[PDB]
A paper describes a structure:
While this level of potency did not warrant follow-up itself, the hit remained of interest because, simultaneously, 1 was identified in a screen against malarial lysyl-tRNA synthetase (IC50 5 µM). This class of enzyme uses ATP, to ligate the amino acid lysine to its uncharged tRNA, making lysyl-tRNA available for use by the protein synthesis machinery. Genetic analysis has shown that in M. tuberculosis the lysyl-tRNA synthetase gene (lysS) is essential. M. tuberculosis LysRS consists of an N-terminal anticodon binding domain (residues 1–150) with the typical oligonucleotide binding fold, common to lysyl-, asparaginyl- and aspartyl- tRNA synthetases, consisting of a central six-stranded beta-barrel with loops or alpha helices connecting the strands. The C-terminal catalytic domain (residues 151–505) consists of a largely antiparallel beta-sheet flanked by alpha helices, typical of class II aminoacyl-tRNA synthetases.
Author numbering:
A (entry chain A), B (entry chain A): 12 to 25, 28 to 74, 76 to 90, 95, 100 to 127, 130 to 134, 136 to 150, 155 to 353, ...
The structure:
């Protein structure tokens, strides 16, 4: 109902300007605080300032007292002025005030005032799914939302800083592709009016990033959304921000180091500690070195028998039954369903079934396995790293097998047959990075989900 | 045909490794050059280096001589080794060589060698539309492609640096939206499997970025692709990288300054001069201050009569006929078709027909016009800046009018009725920025178009 009284204060203000083109705000409230950090309380200083702020509290009394909250969360007596103030000023109203900075019997500004923005809705004094459907109000009313938003920003900025330092170059590769490669996922398809064909929202930059390496790039990344037309869950969302990285004259052993160094550098710059406090009352250490295990061996120890590339699916099936399609898939599933869930400490698992790893080079010594890793941090599948498959004929086969389960990405296969140097790729989910770092749920990490 | 001989050298090399997982490359060729800048030519130095390089030239003679070109473009005698070399090594083959750095009777490496990547295609010794459909080969064979790629990268990095310095925060807003607002364009629609509904690939971050400002952001940007399901031309492509920017307690007069300062800072950091050399043999100065003109006045002087907001469409129609839908549209079209095309120097045109500017605040004094500008640089529509419309009731109307020409973006209108501070937005096309800066065509600016 208060929706209508506010709209009526708008209408009756309209030769007063409730949405004025400008106001001469001289300082943010942070700026005013950082200025006057220990003012002898109940004393006046002649520093004049134009400040603005959301009136999130009032206390009307010859003298009104409000709380102007700046958008970051920082907080900071005309007879006709006072009347206007009382009659015109609600809560969730953005308000400019020019005057002398004092401190009360709390830092306050005491000469002029004007409405910067008249709110036609009061602030709710919030369900998880009304915080996310209205992040703008979440951000106004919940200091955690304001912190979470600025963390992702600081994390993402730490990432670019960490890669750039290492002489990586961020590139922009197509989001609309004639076919979407670089991952096992169902695409989002959109009809082009221009070309009168369907196009595919990238699932991954990998194949394009690989064309760059052929193209002569030493070190490339892309930090940007990918689109996986599948079901959202606690670790999955169909649109998500991803990092991918490609370094020439390195292997998965090289990219494992960098991936660690990167994450530890992000914890530092964004969070200021590797002793990650969680909402579980606990602290998750990610400092120091991280344990590498091979999938097969680790799976074997867990099952109490030797599982190799050579282990039949008939065998694996049986073991999977005893616990409650293909070899590679069964290995990964068993490994996840056994060792995976057990892992607490940050852990690289490497040497992957050649089946479930089409783009990854076969292992240098070990037959049957590919030089891929996965990084598990705080029990979340965080980040993968490959020694990259630069053999077009093999690559052609891997895809052939894929298709059989039949048009291939011929341009990509063309690119490879020009010659790709030996290079190691990584992928890493930013939402998972934040989840893994914070204990925040995926829906809290992104600004505007649905 | 050489496609088959190469595939046969692959097959016959396979216990030689033509795609080896690693090679111990110690330096890039740049690194080796930067190391030995003025070596007394035809003299040997005992600095040993593992280098790799694309053999883009051969000259087989007891002694072969190649050109190893590093991916950036930089350039740098076993009897059985020599035989292998001759028989095994083609052109466009990536090759590692360990040995002593010397200079010939040209800087050369003279101990071991190995194939890093066997190319199953030779390099073409290129049509604009086979350079773009094969950028990986363009990048190998055309030093300009290598420069253009690294410029966009440096431009984009200059942009983030320039904004970040000014205390802007890059945010990630949805690419898939339930409806796509922030611009006049037909969206790309994709069916979600998750939600079983169509979603819309953002045309612009504007409405989401505006929710951020409501949310309490002081200064935000987003630098990232937008999707405009319309026809590609010399200045238009349906997928393009865009900058958008929003500053609280500023007007279009404020955002005009920043837009200039930003572009001039990008010229500097990326190009190293404001005297932009063009392929037209000419130099385009963008240094110093830039001319602001009002659309109406400038249009008037060009037509030789007074055109105001009040000028009828019947009148404007007539004038448009005399030269060869709505007022706002006719004004903009006439202005473009007259003053626009005439402009050489970098020029802001401001004070826009309220019709064609729904999201832009009405002018503070001048009735009928909105506080929008457009920046024309070297005759290209580069960048727009608004004093932003924070009046939800007005905003509701602007959209109502739009629709009538009927579901509105109610969540956005909700956001505004919580209160948005006075803020000024900008948009800027990155491809146009590069075109405007270089004289390069849009298809040359993006890595992977189609
Ligand atoms: N639907 C999805 C799918 C994924 C993610 C997500 F948030 N939603 C994610 O982080 N993924 C991977 C995790 C491993 C390294 C690359 C990113 C996949
Ligand atoms: N289909 C399209 C549409 C546009 C652009 C482009 F390259 N392709 C572009 O640069 N636009 C504008 C130019 C004005 C300021 C914001 C960017 C629109
Ligand atoms: N494309 C991978 C990430 C890069 C892995 C290294 N090639 C993924 O979808 O997870
Ligand atoms: N959304 C605008 C750019 C931002 C203008 C300032 N609000 C466009 O489509 O060009």
């Amino acid at each position: 109902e208060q929706f209508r009284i506010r709209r009526d204060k708008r209408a009756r203000l309209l030769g007063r300007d409730p949405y004025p083109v400008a106001v001469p705000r001289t300082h943010t409230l942070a700026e005013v605080r950082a200025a006057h950090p220990d003012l002898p309380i109940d004393t006046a200083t002649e520093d004049i300032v134009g400040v603005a702020g959301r009136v999130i509290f009032a206390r009307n009394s010859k003298l009104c007292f409000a709380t102007l909250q700046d958008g970051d969360g920082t907080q900071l007596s005309g007879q006709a002025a006072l009347d206007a103030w009382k009659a015109d000023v609600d809560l969730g109203d953005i308000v400019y005030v020019h005057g002398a900075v004092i401190s009360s019997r709390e830092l306050s500004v005491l000469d002029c005032w004007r409405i910067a923005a008249k709110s036609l809705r009061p602030l709710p004094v919030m369900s998880e799914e009304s915080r996310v459907r209205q992040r703008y109000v979440d951000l106004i009313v919940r200091p955690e939302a304001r912190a979470v938003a600025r963390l992702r920003i600081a994390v993402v900025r730490a990432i670019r800083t960490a890669l750039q330092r290492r002489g990586f170059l961020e590139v922009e590769t197509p989001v609309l592709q004639t076919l979407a490669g670089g991952a096992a996922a169902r695409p989002f398809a959109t009809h082009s009016n221009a070309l009168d064909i369907d196009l595919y929202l990238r699932i991954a930059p990998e194949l394009f990033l690989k064309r760059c390496i052929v193209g002569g790039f030493d070190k490339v990344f892309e930090l940007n959304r990918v689109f996986r037309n599948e079901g959202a869950d606690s670790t999955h969302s169909p649109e998500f921000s991803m990092l991918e990285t490609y370094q020439t004259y390195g292997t998965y052993d090289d990219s494992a180091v960098v991936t660690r160094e990167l994450i530890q550098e992000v914890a530092d710059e964004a969070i200021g500690t590797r002793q990650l406090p969680l909402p579980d009352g606990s602290v998750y250490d990610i400092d120091g070195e991280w344990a590498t295990i091979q999938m097969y061996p680790s799976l074997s120890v867990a099952l109490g028998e030797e599982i190799t590339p050579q282990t039949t699916v008939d065998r694996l099936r049986g073991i999977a039954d005893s616990l409650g399609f293909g070899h590679g898939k069964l290995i990964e599933e068993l490994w996840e369903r056994t060792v995976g869930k057990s892992l607490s400490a940050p852990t690289f698992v490497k040497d992957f079934p050649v089946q479930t790893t089409p783009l990854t080079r076969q292992h240098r010594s070990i037959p049957g396995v590919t030089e891929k890793w996965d990084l598990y941090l705080r029990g979340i599948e965080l980040a993968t790293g490959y020694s990259e498959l630069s053999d077009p004929v093999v690559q052609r086969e891997r895809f052939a097998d894929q298709a059989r389960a039949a048009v291939l990405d011929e341009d990509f296969l063309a690119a490879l047959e020009y010659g790709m140097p030996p290079c190691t790729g990584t992928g890493m989910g930013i939402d998972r990075l934040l989840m893994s770092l914070t204990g925040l749920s995926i829906r809290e990490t992104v600004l505007f989900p649905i």
